[PDB]
């Protein structure tokens, strides 16, 4: 049966879970993304109960890989209507400054005698063409757009089994298979779907918007993606609507337009709350893929872990990693309000490296924990906790080994920890 | 009546660099009053007076034929064009190195350009100076014709870049990467006349003809360059600079939009005009043949009406009210370069 864990710290009393390996140790759980998992147990051999091996399962945050197509820059524009009545002849093309606009559509009207709209400022009787046009001026880039081709979700699995340590990236199709441990990411539920268009108003780490309907074959002024700036050039929409030849002051011919005059970007801004937004952390983009970490628990993973029953206890307990803890400094204050920081010199021996967790206990309960990869020699670890009462000298505890010295505090995350300690 | 010209200053003045620039559109004045226009200062800075001297312009106008029979239908010959030399004073005609060294010389440039139709001219007043004048001057009152201009210096955010989702992004200072955060900034360029003895290095019109891939033109003898200012505050930019990515992009925007932005009064928002037709003229008027062409129009003042012929290195200044002078770089003959140029430039950006 699966167990849907959630991020947050829970006050636990002293203790460290010990599991006698009579059967395969099986873990079935689902955790949210942006939530690191820390599962720590001592695996004990049923025969010779003094053979206990450390097991530390560290599951890093979920990174999401998306095969993407670079669609270019979305562009805002200004709807400008212009009417040019030629006093004679046809309407010239690309002969005036307004026809340098990024994109435009013009309609050529014949001169109809008897209409009555004859301007008095032509050198005589004007009989030429009336060139009515819509001109999109002052085109500005408002952000980049990317189309999702495919999606893949991986989580970094790090394991400390006895004196051995390994880290491997796991995804749905590439389970971690070792001789003793198997980590399988069986499924991933997502807010992102293939063919979605990701729009970034600013930098990548500033967030994005999801568009289910992004203009492709038929592009109209006002649609999401109407004006696009591509490497090949400017891709422009149809200016949906029609022209109407009117007469102003019974003298000058003027044209009017029936249709949308608001750009797609401005119509998106007016309805921004209707678009799925998403936050982004540690983004990495190439010419073919986008990689980031969702920090809003929008993603959820399902992980299965199997530890084989027949561990090589003799080879895994040769020179056990020995750490020594000394409490040195403490910042912040106590209580359930302000929280505190605990500095501790941790000295491991025998082993070259060691993945474990140091905890912040008092006399009765632990209020915080920090997991780190200890490098041979001296290590300085910082622990953040919350709680304590008069005389609760805060100390650093490795499972159950706490430092001899204890430090008291002063007057007034999204991680999962599971070391089997009693609640 | 008075009009407030706002000088949008950076917040860092003591640690600031470059210049501060502003511009304002003035009400239209009739054509007769143009030659007697004088820009009066009364400010508390060091005004550069070179632009306040007289310069000969070939005033080039069109008008309907006086002897036009009743109900005569408009044609290419129902109207005439004429040209004559006239002394104009106060226009934006900055000598070289003046704007570039304004930060060191601590001088302030104030001038105006003209955007005209057949009967009136609308002046666009430009004012640029050192960053420190945002403190030493603060408030002033300029004067032009029957108009006064209240000059205010106010500290403003993102004077040199663009606001993206509330965060200021300035153009990249150099271009190692490829394509990333793009900002769109306004540039105001000013034509500079600078001749050299031998080379073709100052024939800027040959650079435009290269950008539009037009071969075989020989009427590009003009010698000069442009000095641009980005936003309301930046260091002066030399156009063209062969290793500056900003220079190549500003030059490219000029090649495909030679007349730049308009100085329209978007009130009423009824953009209707009458195209009188293609016209040619004599610049200077003592010439024996036509040297400049354009499009004669009738309507409200829209684009700049001043420029120089690209053919002569001795600058032939043309003031053509009611005529949009030929600026398309793809032609070879009778083309002009504008005195001032306003555009919007897409540039790679980075956070302040």
């Amino acid at each position: 049966e699966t167990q849907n864990l959630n991020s947050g710290w829970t006050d636990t009393a002293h203790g460290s879970g010990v599991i006698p390996m009579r059967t395969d140790l099986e873990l079935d759980f689902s955790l949210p993304s942006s939530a690191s998992y820390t599962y720590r147990r001592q695996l004990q051999n049923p025969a010779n109960e003094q053979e206990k091996i450390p097991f530390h399962l560290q599951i890093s945050k979920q990174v999401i890989h998306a095969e993407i197509q670079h669609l270019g820059h979305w562009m805002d524009g200004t709807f400008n209507l212009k009417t040019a009545f030629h006093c004679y002849g046809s309407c010239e093309k690309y002969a005036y400054p307004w026809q340098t606009a990024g994109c435009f559509v013009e309609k050529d009207y014949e001169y109809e005698s008897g209409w009555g709209c004859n301007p008095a400022d032509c050198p005589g009787v004007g009989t030429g063409c009336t060139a009515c046009g819509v001109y999109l001026d002052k085109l500005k880039s408002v952000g980049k757009a990317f189309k999702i081709v495919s999606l893949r979700y991986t989580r970094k699995a790090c394991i400390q089994l006895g004196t051995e340590q390994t880290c491997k990236n796991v995804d749905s199709n590439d389970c971690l298979v070792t001789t003793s441990v198997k980590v399988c990411l069986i499924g991933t539920v997502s807010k992102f779907q293939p063919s979605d268009t990701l729009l970034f108003l600013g930098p990548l780490e500033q967030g994005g918007l999801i568009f289910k309907q992004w203009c492709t074959t038929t592009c109209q002024f006002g649609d999401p993606g109407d004006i696009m700036s591509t490497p090949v050039g400017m891709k422009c929409p149809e200016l949906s609507g029609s022209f109407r030849k009117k007469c102003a002051f019974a003298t000058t011919p003027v044209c009017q337009f029936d249709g949308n005059t608001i750009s797609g970007y401005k119509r998106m801004i007016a309805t921004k709350d209707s678009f799925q937004s998403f936050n982004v952390t540690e983004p990495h983009i190439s010419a073919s893929s986008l990689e980031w970490i969702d920090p809003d628990s929008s993603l959820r993973d399902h992980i299965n872990v199997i530890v084989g029953r027949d561990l090589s206890f003799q080879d895994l307990s040769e020179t056990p990693c020995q750490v020594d803890l000394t409490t040195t400094s403490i910042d912040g204050a106590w209580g359930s309000g302000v929280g505190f920081n605990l500095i501790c010199s941790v000295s491991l021996t025998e082993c070259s490296t060691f993945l474990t967790s140091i905890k912040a206990c008092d006399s009765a309960m632990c209020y915080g924990s920090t997991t780190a990869n200890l490098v041979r020699g001296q290590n300085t670890v910082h622990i953040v906790g919350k709680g304590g009462h008069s005389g609760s000298k805060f100390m650093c505890c490795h499972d159950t080994k706490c430092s001899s010295t204890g430090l008291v505090a002063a007057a007034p995350s999204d991680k999962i920890f599971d070391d089997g300690a009693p609640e | 009546n008075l009009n407030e010209l706002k000088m949008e200053c950076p917040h860092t003045i003591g640690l600031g660099q470059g210049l501060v620039i502003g511009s304002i559109e003035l009400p239209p004045v009739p054509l007769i009053q143009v030659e007697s226009l004088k820009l009066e200062s009364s400010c508390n800075f060091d005004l550069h007076t070179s632009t306040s001297s007289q310069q000969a312009f070939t005033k080039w106008t069109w008008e309907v034929k006086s002897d036009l029979a009743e109900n005569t239908q408009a044609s290419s010959t129902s109207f005439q064009t004429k040209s004559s030399e006239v002394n104009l004073r106060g226009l934006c005609l900055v000598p070289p190195l003046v704007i570039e060294t304004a930060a060191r010389t601590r001088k302030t440039i104030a001038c105006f350009d003209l955007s005209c139709n057949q009967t009136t001219c609308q002046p666009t007043v430009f004012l640029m100076g050192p960053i420190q004048t945002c403190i030493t001057t603060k408030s002033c009152l300029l004067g032009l014709g029957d108009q006064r201009i209240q000059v205010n210096y106010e500290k403003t955010y993102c004077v040199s870049g663009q606001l993206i989702e509330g965060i200021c992004f300035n153009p990249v200072h150099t271009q190692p990467s490829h394509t990333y955060d793009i900002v769109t900034v306004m540039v105001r360029c000013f034509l500079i006349v600078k001749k050299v003895t031998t080379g073709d290095s100052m024939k800027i019109e040959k650079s435009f003809e290269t950008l539009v891939q037009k071969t075989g033109c020989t009427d590009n003898g003009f010698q000069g360059y442009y000095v641009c200012l980005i936003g309301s505050s930046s260091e002066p930019l030399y156009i063209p600079t062969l290793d500056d990515y900003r220079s190549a992009e500003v030059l490219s925007r000029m090649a495909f939009a030679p007349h730049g932005e308009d100085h329209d009064i978007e009130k009423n928002a009824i953009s209707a005009m009458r195209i009188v037709g293609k016209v040619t003229g004599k610049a200077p008027s003592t010439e024996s043949s036509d040297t400049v062409q354009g499009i004669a129009f009738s309507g409200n003042p829209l684009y700049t009406s001043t420029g120089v012929l690209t053919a002569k290195d001795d600058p032939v200044y043309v003031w053509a009210p009611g005529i949009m002078m030929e600026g398309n770089h793809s032609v070879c003959d009778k083309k002009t370069l504008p005195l001032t140029w306003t555009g919007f430039i897409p540039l790679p950006g980075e956070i302040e």
Partner: antibody
Framework: QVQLVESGGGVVQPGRSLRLSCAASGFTFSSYAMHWVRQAPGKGLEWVAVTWFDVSKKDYADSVKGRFTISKNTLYLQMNSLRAEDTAVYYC???????????????????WGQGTTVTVSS | DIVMTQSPLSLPVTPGEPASISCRSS???????????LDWYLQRPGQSPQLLISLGSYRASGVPDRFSGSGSGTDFTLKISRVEAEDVGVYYC????????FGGGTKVE
């Protein structure tokens, strides 16, 4: 400048074929109508055909209707089944018209071609 | 049908006097727009025809003031004051609409 140059003129027998051409330059071909006017030896002037409003509308004279078809910025005139009474010097002319499908001039034929000669008699 | 009739087939005169040419139509040339659809052309001995008057009375550009057009309906007239040496040639009135019928020629010398 603006000018019209004709070509393709010659001399053949009745019943054969001939095609004239008129190369225009200096003016927009969609703003002016283009006429063909011939002049028999020692005789007056005779209008032949015309095209206007770009090249979408065409008209011909009764004496030639159905036999000629008025088609680089050049104008063509295909003379098919040219009977022996079309002997003339054929001119190419332009004129300004109101911008509409309905032909109505603003002024007459101002600039003409130098003319081309075609005689058919056997 | 419709045909144009020109008066004197030949108009010989000295240099420096008035001259008159008439052109009469079978039907009215006054269009609903208010213009007389008639032009006046001149053909010098070795030259192509040239434009003198368009739409009855509108003197063409580049044509000196001595030429003048007048008339309405069916009776039109071309006046030329102080005939010069350059005026030699044949004069043709032409209908400005489709049936573009010519007058037939009037010789001056």
């Amino acid at each position: 400048q603006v000018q019209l140059v004709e070509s393709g003129g010659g001399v053949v027998q009745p019943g054969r074929s001939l095609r004239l051409s008129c190369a225009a330059s200096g003016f927009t071909f969609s703003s002016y109508a283009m006429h063909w006017v011939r002049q028999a030896p020692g005789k007056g002037l005779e209008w032949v055909a015309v095209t206007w409003f770009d090249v979408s509308k065409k008209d011909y004279a009764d004496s030639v209707k159905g036999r000629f078809t008025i088609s680089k910025n050049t104008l063509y005139l295909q003379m098919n089944s040219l009977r022996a009474e079309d002997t003339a010097v054929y001119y190419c002319a332009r004129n300004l018209i109101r911008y509409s499908g309905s032909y109505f001039p603003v002024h007459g034929m101002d600039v003409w071609g130098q003319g081309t000669t075609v005689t058919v008699s056997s | 049908d419709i045909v144009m009739t020109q008066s004197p087939l030949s108009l010989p005169v000295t240099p420096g006097e008035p001259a008159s040419i008439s052109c009469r139509s079978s039907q009215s040339l006054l269009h609903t727009y208010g213009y007389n659809c008639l032009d006046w052309y001149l053909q010098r001995p070795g030259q192509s025809p040239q434009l003198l008057i368009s739409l009855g009375s509108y003197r063409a550009s580049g044509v000196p003031d001595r030429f003048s057009g007048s008339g309405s309906g069916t009776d039109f007239t071309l006046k030329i004051s102080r005939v010069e040496a350059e005026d030699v040639g044949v004069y043709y009135c032409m209908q400005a609409l489709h049936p573009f019928t010519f007058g037939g020629g009037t010789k001056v010398e």
